[PDB]
């Protein structure tokens, strides 16, 4: 089912501090090597009054390098696909919730992303656009209630040094019954390779490989 090189196509719709936006994206990656690229075009709500980094983790764990001794909950979930529900709690009470229904047909992955954000302070790093990048991270994967849960202590480096903390909690739900893995970790690194003046156009890179402690 999952080809060694899979094309990506998506559409994110949402609101941050009540600001409606729509972002379409087309990308390409290698799911077995755990890397992928995505070119994102802001279709609606441009210019964005908030930092683009807060959207980057919502823009697919199928694009993870999985060893043999660790069942791949994500790749096994296909052709049908899976879906995820994510909460992202910032240290300044600014909170985001996101969802994605991931489907497939041919060599292309398809996503429908819903992202909602609120209670970000006007003079904070997000709304003032003071965020430079997400520090690299490790997501703790464990099975709960028959589905896969993931937790990651995220942190955005800011303009002028210092970090901006976020607590991520995700629930991955396979559309079919699959072999549930035993608890593991996912080392990740997401980075915006290139962008324009207001991030109307963005190239985004991700690298993630799963392992045991």
Author numbering: 3 to 61, 65 to 218
Sentences from the study reporting this entry:
eCGP123 is a bright green FP engineered for extreme stability, and was developed using a two-step process. Phanta was isolated by expression screening of a library targeting amino acid positions 62/63/65/69 and 191/192/193 in the bright green fluorescent protein eCGP123. Phanta contains the substitutions Gln62Met, Thr69Val and His193Gln. The protomers in each protein are typical of the GFP-superfamily and consist of an 11-stranded β-barrel (or β-can) with two small helices forming interconnecting loops protecting the chromophore from bulk solvent.
The absorbance spectrum of eCGP123T69V showed a major absorbing species at 506 nm whilst eCGP123H193Q contained significant amounts of a 387 nm species in addition to the 506 nm species. In the case of eCGP123H193Q titration above pH 8 did not diminish the amount of the protonated form, suggesting that two distinct populations of the chromophore exist, only one of which can be titrated for pH. The results show that under violet light illumination recovery of the ON state for CGP123H193Q driven was minor, whereas thermally induced recovery of the ON state (no illumination) was near complete after 35 mins incubation at 25°C. The conversion OFF to ON rates for Phanta, eCGP123, eCGP123H193Q and eCGP123T69V were determined and are similar. These results suggest that photoswitching of eCGP123H193Q into the ON state is inefficient. The spectral data obtained for eCGP123H193Q suggest the possibility that both the protonated and anionic chromophore are present in the structure but only a single chromophore species appears to be represented in the structural data. However, electron density corresponding to the 4-hyroxybenzyl ring in protomers of both the weakly fluorescent eCGP123H193Q (ΦF, 0.004) and strongly fluorescent eCGP123T69V (ΦF, 0.32) is well defined, indicating a rigid chromophore, and suggesting that a mobile chromophore is not responsible for poor fluorescence emission of eCGP123H193Q. In Phanta and eCGP123H193Q the imidazole ring of His193 is substituted by the polar side chain of a glutamine leaving the chromophore with a reduced number of stabilising interactions. In Phanta and eCGP123H193Q, Glu215 no longer interacts with the side chain of Gln193 that replaces the histidine at position 193. Instead a hydrogen bond is formed between the Nδ1 of Gln193 and the Oγ of Ser142, which in turn forms a hydrogen bond with Oη of the chromophore. In eCGP123H193Q contact between Glu144 and Arg66 is maintained through a water-mediated (H2O783) hydrogen bond. Collectively these data suggest that the very low fluorescence efficiency of Phanta and eCGP123H193Q is a result of removing the stabilising effects of π-π interactions between His193 and the chromophore in the excited state, together with alterations to the scaffold extending around the chromophore.
